[PDB]
């Protein structure tokens, strides 16, 4: 069996990428990326200018996940951008760059500037409008006016098809504003749900410590922690934005966490923590579980089972 | 060695009570409550009227926490007064008492009933602005007008000393929001963090069917999941809110997991999911293993640690 995806106008061996931030910073991490199994790969959220990041340690991960407060940090958006015009092999892979611009003019200046390559190239634009880390500046789609502003301004910027990281949200009433926001742009056409869960905090017993140094230890969870959240918002803006497909990311270490995802609604499984502790041969691992569990229920495609999560009565 | 605590006006044996929800429903549950190690007790959130609450399965249980979707289930107001007022043995322990009207004026109606009670028998209110199961009735505290609009209408109803129970939050900015709320009512003494962790899913891979009935699938995440939300949550209140007590709730299954809580700030350490699933002789267990953890550490008292996380530089 295999698997063939379609979709953005592109063709995917497998669902499988990294999650941005998660080894796609450099360009020896995107070309192992790119050598890897995976089916597609995203870079590393830049900003216009290159930053440093937050002081060290910024990432820590444990038994049930990981905490991080990685904060500005990448090589700026001319990096990437030369990434996608020159360097890449699309032979191989699709690529998505993604962009965290820390105020609306930011986006809009690098997005004006990505569309050419976007039209020569292909590259896909993943706008991260949930970054937990930056001291100052929350999560731009916890704030529905801000986020709306966010997407009329680079939608006329870029005119282009382009996706959305979002954060997890926990309540009914957001999910049906924030999809109701997503569903006013129709150039908007995935919706990668979810970001980390933001500023949770890990503390360690024996030293009587926070973990990592930034924001006074808080941090976004990664992980098995953050799973059945992940799961809600997948299937929440499935279920919601029915013109549009849904990227699922969190808590997938397994073929079978994988096969959730995808029975929630997801079409591109994007793994974060698992990769950045088992690194890039999870995908081989990711691939051969999910054809096993396919194969032991009859399911020839992913498109029997996406989104096919049944209800109780 | 001691684990005693005086707050409140009140002396309590040990940190440790139920969450509010788990064990406490019935008199035949507040009385094993009651007669358990627990320092004190909490009842189910009531309204004023009595409820069945969602149809069956409403609660599931894994390894790494719980699920739920109770929604309005209790024996009502009228109940719960009564076994304040006649019920209820105060020379074993305090009873906190838990409200969760579906409206502002409903809520008053019952502060304005547990009034008299409260001053005669020292029952503590437990305002519960947080559950995330009501269709049609988001978590109050995650809209801050609201939020105000409660607050004042039960203080100037009520005119005693309460406290809230919090929904978690997930961005600074809303922590710095929530808090400065509850910092205009002099008479909200204690804050209770966190609730479940709203709106979480499920699937199992077998079935590839959600656990619970109501809503979807969809419920309130609860157990090893949500300890470094419940952590955050803790701080980020203890911090901001210097004139009250911060009750810890969350993910709590080991003297360790209330050591974290309590030196995120906590006083009172709650536990729901843990007892759900292994019943109240929990509490023997989790006075011996914070004891321990105290004695191996050199700590005499609660008080020389609560609160006392280190950050890093
Ligand atoms: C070290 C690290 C850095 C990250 N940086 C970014 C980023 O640049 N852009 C972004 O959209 N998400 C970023 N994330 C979030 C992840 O893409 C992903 O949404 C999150 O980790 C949850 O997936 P997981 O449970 O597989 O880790 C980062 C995560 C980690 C652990
Ligand atoms: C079966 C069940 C019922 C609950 N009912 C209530 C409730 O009536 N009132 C309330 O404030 N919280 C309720 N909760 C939330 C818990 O009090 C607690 O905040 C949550 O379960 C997180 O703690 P934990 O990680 O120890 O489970 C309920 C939780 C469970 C599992
Ligand atoms: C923040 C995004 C940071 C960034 C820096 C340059 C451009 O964007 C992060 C994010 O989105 N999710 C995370 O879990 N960690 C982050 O630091
Ligand atoms: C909801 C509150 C239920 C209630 C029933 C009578 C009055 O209020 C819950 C809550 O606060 N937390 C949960 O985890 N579960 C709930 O269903
Ligand atoms: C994320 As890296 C460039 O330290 O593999
Ligand atoms: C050495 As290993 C844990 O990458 O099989």
């Known amino acids: ?47 216009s200018a290159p930053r440093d990041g937050n002081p060290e340690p910024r ?27 020159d360097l890449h092999d699309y032979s191989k892979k699709p690529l998505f760059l993604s962009i965290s611009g820390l105020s609306v003019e930011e986006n809009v200046a690098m997005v004006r500037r990505l569309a050419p390559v976007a039209q020569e190239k292909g590259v896909l634009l993943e706008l991260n409008l949930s970054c937990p880390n930056v001291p100052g500046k929350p999560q731009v789609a916890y704030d529905f006016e801000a986020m709306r502003t966010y997407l009329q ?12 990281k979002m954060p997890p949200y926990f309540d ?23 970001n980390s869960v933001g500023n949770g905090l890990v503390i ?8 990592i140094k930034p924001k006074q230890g808080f941090g976004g969870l990664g992980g098995k922690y953050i799973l059945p959240t992940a799961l809600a918002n997948v299937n929440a803006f499935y279920r919601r934005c029915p013109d549009k497909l849904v990227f699922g990311c969190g808590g997938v270490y397994s073929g079978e966490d994988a096969f959730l995802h995808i ?10 923590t698992a990769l950045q502790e088992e690194g890039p041969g999870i995908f081989t691992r990711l691939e051969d579980e999910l054809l096993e569990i396919m194969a032991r229920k009859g399911y020839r495609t992913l498109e029997e089972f996406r989104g096919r999560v049944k209800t109780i009565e």
């Open 1 to 47: 069996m295999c698997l063939k995806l379609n979709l953005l106008d592109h063709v995917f061996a497998n669902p499988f990428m990294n999650a941005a931030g998660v080894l796609c910073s450099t360009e020896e991490d995107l070309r192992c990326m790119t050598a890897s199994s995976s089916g597609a790969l995203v870079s590393k959220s830049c900003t």
């Open 59 to 85: 990432y820590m991960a444990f038994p049930l996940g990981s905490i991080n407060s990685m904060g500005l940090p990448n090589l700026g958006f001319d990096f990437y951008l030369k990434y996608a015009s």
């Open 153 to 164: 301004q680079v939608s006329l910027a870029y005119g282009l098809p382009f996706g959305v």
């Open 172 to 194: 009914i009433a957001h999910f049906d504003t924030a999809a109701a926001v997503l569903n006013e742009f129709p150039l908007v056409k995935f919706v990668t749900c979810v």
């Open 204 to 211: 360690d017993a024996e030293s009587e410590s926070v973990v």
């Open 263 to 272: 029975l929630a609604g997801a079409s591109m499984v994007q793994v974060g």
